[PDB]
Symmetry: C3
């Protein structure tokens, strides 16, 4: 019935994003994506703590999918027979049937194909939602990602001016609830099923043990820092499927921020810290002006520094002493000061 | 002194709203409302847990009051002699005297009449506020509702276009703090006074035991699902007097959202999830496009699924396969897949 | 190299703000500020609980600094040899080097001079950020304040109209994490270093023991209530360096609110409650219409009433019975009522 060109997209692992155009003169296409569920034990902190994760495509978050307004998105969801649980997928970008969750429930050994029309622009969460208490459990076990639906003309500033990004990163933030024994040590389990009852008890107290970007504390630091150059406009897409976050680029700003994540609304300008509502994605554009290390955090600094929620950008270029300078290096306080 | 027509309004129990006009060519009236305080034990979850509630008009939330900008709102507050505590009322919509709290303190056996002018448009919280630690205790015991002050021309989209709703629902969200015994079982008390000291201890840790819509887990599910039809524009008013919430319509969107709840500000368009600040009301307009079950949740999914914060909409109509379709039902993964 | 006039500013203790112009026809200046770190035991609640604070200039919050867009801000940071720890300063208003943190680390006995250009308008947080887990610890120990960068033409309503305030107050909100012994009593320590390990354990559970304005429960109540007059436009700057807040003026409104705190964005109008993201400052303008006591709170009323987060305004003037009146004082319920 639906007679449009089909285009297969190969997803890549976050924080990177598959190749796509910003502005396009192409008409609506059927964009084909495949997501494979993988249940697996993963390391989530720098002391080696593990937990029974559940993922789309082996990563937390799941990959970012990028399409344009008016496209049709055809998603094959695969639940391999090595998994132990039923899974599904709900797209906040889609209309009807609980975002598709009601049409995509699959047992291990099955697959399903859903098609939804991208009628609403913005960044949106997708997540597993099998039903009842399984919904939060699957989500906080890692089964969430995001989709970006761009306007066909690309981004604009809400006042008639085009905005173009040179680079795009997807930072998925995950709240985790890892059970502890009586001495406070983290517990380990041989399967998701075995972890469930203890995990639910932690979840009920609503306080995460870990808050991570890209699936583990320190994932986007050190040699996995994100790269940029002075003068580049970088789009940072941030999602949180379950709990609020307050992104902040230390030493920078959000030049243009869609904190509710929807491109039909004009962005706010010059933010210090923005706010991602749990269950949503947002996006921030920033043009780097200074080289050096930047920390991207949630500005609950306890979460950022002590629970895992810090990423680094490494920015190449020349220092601008007009914007900031050390006038006098650390020196002894003058004895003749009051 | 004030010589305007008087109009008695009969309130109805949430989630329904008393009859009112959107746009009106009537001039300012004195709109007369009565609220009766009722202290009573109520069931708040599906396992039958009870707690010592305190309510306006026997319901959590208290009823929605609807007036127009420039109206005068004359509220009779009654505290029957069967109650045990003093109560009052503070309207976030009103100006002066702590929103009226300073003028409405009444002992059991008394009543009081307050008049305030509706100078500010939007949805607003009202709540009991007797003084000091009694303020949070009364509010989280259920003594809160909302008032909507419409512009005389009804809603608009902030760009010169009228917005009209076909239906309106009021969803009051309540955080509850129910004491537990040493084994974790919920405790029961013979009066609010007896529950106070144990309840305060839970409140101090800032983590609710339950988060409910319309006063109990499952209140707006099953046979009390909210009804709509494909093509209808539905206004959902959401209040939270004490704690933030992040409403989300699963399978839908917020077409027009006033998340801060004030109609002098243009709405945001096409939201996935919005944000109600604790101590505020907000409103979202959505035109249903697909039939079926929709879950309305706070998108902390732990709260939604495990603490009680899920409502259902049942929407009648015909399915639109253009917007979403199952291309291939669950089937075995092809043996010839990689 | 930089050849502009220099102007020394003398800071004052919050909630007051040093003298400054709103609109200015002066050109860019180098505005010189000095901040001295002071570690000291402080009382933070009405029962006399103490904690090992760390402050800029002896106060929580640190003082508000006010400059205009295009000014250069030259800050001398002094760490006296009586302190025990290294400190630094990061300005969310500044660009590069982690907001200046990377250029300002000083040991006890040292001082440093940083210059940054005020390129972005709004209110912004500044805070200590020495590195790693020390970042949250220093911030929640009190080392945070705010800077306001005004447009040269002063505030506007985003629709071409000037806004001018008659008075300005800075309300810094601080989440504190005070260790308890096994009976629940607060612990005391002889130094910040000794408190660290127990404090970190409380911080990890993300629930404050106290939430205060101006450094202690009741700081801005009683005789330290903030003064205003009917008809005065008052600007309230509110900062929270680590945790979200939801300001509300009980009996009032926010006439014009920049909840994200950035003056390049038009304010929202007529808010009941607004939202300060942790890691940010915001500002609200209100013109008092009624005399009397107003409570300024975070509208988590548990925090407001039971954890310390309430300030008072005392407003002088004449009561306006048109806006609000008690039509009938408390009286016995008529025996002939149903
Ligand atoms: O023996 C405990 C010790 O070993 C580590 C080393 O990386 O990890 C093990 O124990 C953890 C807690 O049960 C598990 O999460 C992990 O799967 C296991 O390899 C340390 O994290 C831990 O303290
Ligand atoms: O607005 C984007 C997109 O959503 C649709 C429905 O799929 O329209 C919704 O939003 C419109 C603009 O606010 C409303 O006027 C309409 O009633 C509502 O369904 C699309 O038609 C529109 O392109
Ligand atoms: O957190 C309580 C308590 O547990 C211990 C081990 O008994 O450490 C655990 O918790 C720490 C904080 O989450 C982790 O850093 C560590 O991996 C974990 O074993 C104690 O060190 C701590 O006091
Ligand atoms: O890119 C940051 C990196 O560059 C160095 C020299 O290679 O210094 C530059 O950046 C400093 C601020 O971080 C400036 O103060 C300095 O003047 C400038 O040359 C390194 O020191 C720095 O890590
Ligand atoms: O006997 C405990 C058992 O009975 C239930 C049945 O609905 O409710 C009773 O006990 C609860 C806990 O004290 C009370 O809240 C309730 O008022 C009382 O009827 C169960 O909820 C409970 O587990
Ligand atoms: O704005 C709605 C309504 O509020 C009042 C006071 O009751 O005005 C406030 O807001 C005006 C518009 O922002 C301000 O200009 C005014 O100073 C402030 O009191 C009403 O006059 C107005 O209709
Ligand atoms: O929550 C701790 C612990 O308490 C038990 C009974 O001992 O259940 C209580 O708490 C549950 C979660 O809130 C409720 O579902 C139930 O109504 C209540 O009695 C245990 O089941 C649980 O481990
Ligand atoms: O209204 C939802 C309800 O309608 C049924 C048939 O009565 O199916 C319709 O809705 C489905 C999506 O939920 C579509 O896939 C289907 O094609 C459409 O006919 C029921 O299956 C469904 O519960
Ligand atoms: O003896 C405990 C009792 O004294 C008070 C009186 O103000 O304060 C003391 O004890 C507190 C808890 O250790 C300390 O924070 C404080 O420094 C010390 O003077 C009461 O607060 C306390 O209950
Ligand atoms: O916008 C305020 C201020 O920020 C600067 C950089 O210091 O510009 C940023 O924001 C501009 C307006 O959005 C962007 O166009 C620009 O690319 C970005 O660096 C200043 O130039 C501007 O005055
Ligand atoms: O909070 C638990 C428990 O501790 C006690 C003293 O044992 O009081 C402490 O905690 C109170 C609430 O934070 C404070 O008001 C008080 O200053 C502190 O000592 C008990 O009173 C309470 O049950
Ligand atoms: O300014 C408030 C203060 O004024 C008094 C009289 O001095 O009363 C005025 O304010 C009341 C509302 O708070 C009005 O009801 C009253 O009519 C008005 O005269 C005091 O009662 C009040 O505390
Ligand atoms: O559906 N999963 O447990
Ligand atoms: O400025 N960063 O916390
Ligand atoms: O005023 N009530 O406890
Ligand atoms: O999409 N609902 O969680
Ligand atoms: O740097 N301070 O611990
Ligand atoms: O209206 N104040 O809580
Ligand atoms: Cu799943
Ligand atoms: Cu009450
Ligand atoms: Cu410090």
């Amino acid at each position: 019935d639906l007679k449009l060109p089909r285009q297969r997209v190969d997803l890549v692992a976050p924080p990177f994003v598959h190749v796509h155009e910003q502005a396009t003169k192409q008409g609506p296409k059927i964009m084909e994506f495949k997501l494979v569920v993988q249940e697996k034990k993963m390391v989530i902190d720098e002391k080696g703590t593990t937990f029974q994760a559940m993922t789309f495509n082996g990563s937390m978050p799941g990959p970012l999918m990028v399409v344009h307004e008016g496209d049709y998105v055809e998603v094959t969801l695969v639940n391999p027979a090595t998994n132990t649980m039923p899974h599904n997928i709900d797209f906040h970008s889609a209309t009807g049937a609980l975002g598709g969750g009601a049409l995509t429930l699959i047992n291990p050994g099955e697959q399903v194909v859903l098609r939804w029309k991208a009628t609403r622009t913005g960044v949106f969460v997708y997540h597993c939602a099998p039903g009842g208490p399984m919904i939060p459990w699957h989500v906080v076990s890692g089964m969430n990602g995001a989709v970006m639906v761009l306007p066909r003309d690309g981004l604009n500033d809400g006042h008639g001016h085009s905005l173009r990004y040179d680079r795009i990163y997807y930072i998925g933030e995950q709240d985790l609830y890892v059970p502890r024994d009586e001495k406070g040590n983290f517990k380990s389990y041989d399967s998701p099923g075995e972890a469930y009852s203890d995990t639910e008890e932690v979840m009920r107290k609503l306080t995460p043990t870990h808050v991570v970007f890209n699936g583990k504390a320190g994932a986007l630091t050190g040699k996995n820092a994100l790269n940029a150059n002075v003068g580049e406009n970088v789009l940072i897409v941030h999602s949180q499927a379950n709990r609020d976050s307050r992104p902040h680029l230390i030493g920078g700003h959000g030049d243009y921020v869609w904190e509710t994540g929807k491109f039909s609304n004009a962005p706010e300008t010059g933010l210090e810290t923005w706010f991602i509502r749990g269950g949503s994605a947002g996006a921030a554009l920033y043009k780097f002006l200074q080289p050096g290390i930047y920390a991207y955090v949630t500005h609950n600094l306890i979460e950022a520094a002590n629970l895992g929620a810090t990423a680094h950008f490494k920015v190449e270029g020349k220092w601008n002493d007009d914007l900031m300078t050390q006038v006098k290096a650390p020196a002894d306080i003058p004895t003749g000061s009051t």
